[PDB]
Design a protein around this ligand. Structure first.
Ligand SMILES: *[C@@H](C)[C@H]1/C(=C/c2[nH]c(/C=C3N=C(/C=C4/NC(=O)C(CC)=C4C)C(C)=C\3CCC(=O)O)c(CCC(=O)O)c2C)NC(=O)[C@@H]1C
Ligand SMILES: *[C@@H](C)[C@H]1/C(=C/c2[nH]c(/C=C3N=C(/C=C4/NC(=O)C(CC)=C4C)C(C)=C\3CCC(=O)O)c(CCC(=O)O)c2C)NC(=O)[C@@H]1C
Lengths: 299, 297
């Protein structure tokens, strides 16, 4: 029930379209502090066509969900990307903030993001088969040019489930990890499914003060939120990251197919870092492609 | 000096950033009709400030397209697509429904993601069959665009064209295997096919619109590369006899030793428009198709 404080979270009831859980920083972020709490209808917060654009999604099944919806707060004119997913009877929105001079550029930032992702995919296919080393080298390189982080590493999970840094690129001056071997318990099991579930997963600042999520108290159970892109890490991984002077990361999951988590393609930064939803989504596609050629060379 | 009427055009002086030529419809599309728009207008008066400063930043450009803009009072939104010529900067304006503006980026990711699916089905093909390559592409395109008819043209060594791959909606006469003379496509239309990469005709019976420029302009304003450009009135008549009212053409250039190897072509039986992000995503699907075509050769 914790989320990172670079965006905010709102869950709604699918039938009524009324807030049934909100993150602690939502009302400061989305209104002028007409208020926001349990109960709020969403027409009272955004402009009409953002509001009208959210309600259409209720109807779309999750084989027709198209993110991000670009929204504008009613009064402030403040613009966010809204990022939807569905857990049985309930909608859950991640809002992520848009700088104002990006609003005119949102279609062609989308297009460019995929354009780089697609090209890097071409460089992948044209590679001669046989070598896991040049493949995984190309993967981490392309991801480095694509994402700008301070370090990029692939991992590979052996049958014991422990991992070996099998590939690596960094900006000049940083200590290497290429080759090293760490224990299978360094990544807990329920974390491993979560990676499998949210194909891309992002931590903007491990020293962030995290924020709480408040649900309607007339619900007899607790609502599932670990799908949200604003999922807050465990405080244990946050200290591990700070000690090793990696403060941001972005993760990609390597699921082959007999379906298994093979590995992870990862970026680490030594200062804060935020990449917006159009990129993260491009990386979903690169990840699948990479999973397919990894499985090919196993054969 | 004419453009298709679904959009409107503007060209700006590269130095002063005021209008130096405008399409006749444009005062009606951009202003809800000095006259609000003519030779001399500052675009600062036409649009809203961040839409205007979005445009002024392209004067320093590398160019990314399309820039969504809004008009001053109405708030009508447009995709604004930009390209460069010698002393000026040209803008095509295309219409964007006001209640889909929240869905712009998602309609942009959703198109380029389908194109990228087609690119992997192509590259995973067993090599050694030009017939298998084209048959997939025209079927991949056939699902991406949704026109009534997709075909491939191959240009022989005497420049005549052959329909070497096709897939259609059921009930239409197939044109597969047909040959046609070289004079059906003049050489200037082939160079423009190489330069625009992807060209669209929305309604070959649409009445075309003239572009007016101040005649004291010290150079001629060329609309060669403008996504609105009208067809020559000869092709709009040949299209009607074939029952094709709208098309979408994607050139297949090899060694980009540059030569136009052929075309991937979409014809439809009723008017049909597709917004620029998709066309942009197919602009890459063609390049990947030309790269595999050259391998087979
Ligand atoms: C505390 C409860 C335990 C814990 C939790 C935890 N760890 C992760 C993710 C990673 N931990 C990694 C560990 C290693 N081991 C190495 O040798 C190494 C190089 C210095 C690292 C970083 C590791 C590889 C990951 C994967 C993510 C990554 O950035 O590479 C998580 C998931 C975080 C999330 O919410 O996304 C949790 C909860 N880790 C411990 O060490 C404790 C035993
Ligand atoms: C009048 C000046 C001449 C003319 C001009 C013209 N033609 C095109 C494009 C095409 N013409 C095609 C012709 C054929 N011939 C066939 O047998 C056949 C199959 C039934 C067709 C469609 C042809 C293949 C094209 C290419 C475009 C396409 O639809 O695939 C153009 C270019 C139009 C533009 O502005 O983009 C012009 C100017 N065509 C004639 O027939 C006259 C002799």
């Amino acid at each position: 029930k914790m989320i990172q404080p670079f965006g905010c979270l709102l869950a709604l009831d699918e039938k009524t379209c009324k807030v049934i859980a909100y993150s602690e920083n939502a009302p400061e972020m989305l209104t002028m502090v007409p208020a926001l709490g349990i109960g709020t209808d969403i027409k009272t917060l955004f402009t009409a066509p953002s509001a009208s654009a959210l309600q259409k999604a209720l109807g779309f099944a999750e084989v027709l969900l198209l993110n991000p919806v670009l929204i504008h707060c009613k009064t402030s004119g403040k613009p966010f990307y809204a990022i939807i997913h569905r857990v049985t009877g309930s909608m859950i929105i991640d809002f992520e903030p848009v700088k104002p001079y990006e609003v005119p550029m949102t279609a062609a930032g989308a297009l460019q993001s995929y354009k780089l992702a697609a090209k890097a995919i071409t460089r992948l296919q044209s590679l001669p088969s046989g070598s896991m080393e040049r493949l995984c080298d190309t993967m981490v390189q392309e991801v480095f040019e694509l994402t700008g982080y301070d370090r990029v590493m692939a991992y590979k999970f052996h049958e014991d489930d422990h991992g070996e840094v099998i590939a690596e690129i960094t900006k000049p001056g940083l200590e290497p990890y290429l080759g090293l071997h760490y224990p299978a318990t360094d990544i807990p099991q329920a974390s491993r499914f979560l990676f499998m579930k949210n194909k891309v997963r992002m931590i903007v600042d491990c020293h962030a003060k995290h924020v709480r999520v408040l649900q309607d108290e007339k619900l007899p159970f607790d609502l599932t939120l670990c799908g949200s892109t604003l999922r807050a890490p465990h405080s244990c991984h946050a200290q591990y990251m700070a000690n090793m002077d990696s403060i941001a990361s972005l993760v990609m999951a390597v699921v082959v197919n007999r379906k298994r988590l093979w590995g992870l393609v990862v970026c680490h930064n030594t200062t804060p870092r935020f990449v917006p939803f159009p990129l993260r989504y491009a990386c979903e596609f690169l990840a699948q492609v990479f999973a397919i050629h990894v499985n090919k060379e196993i054969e």
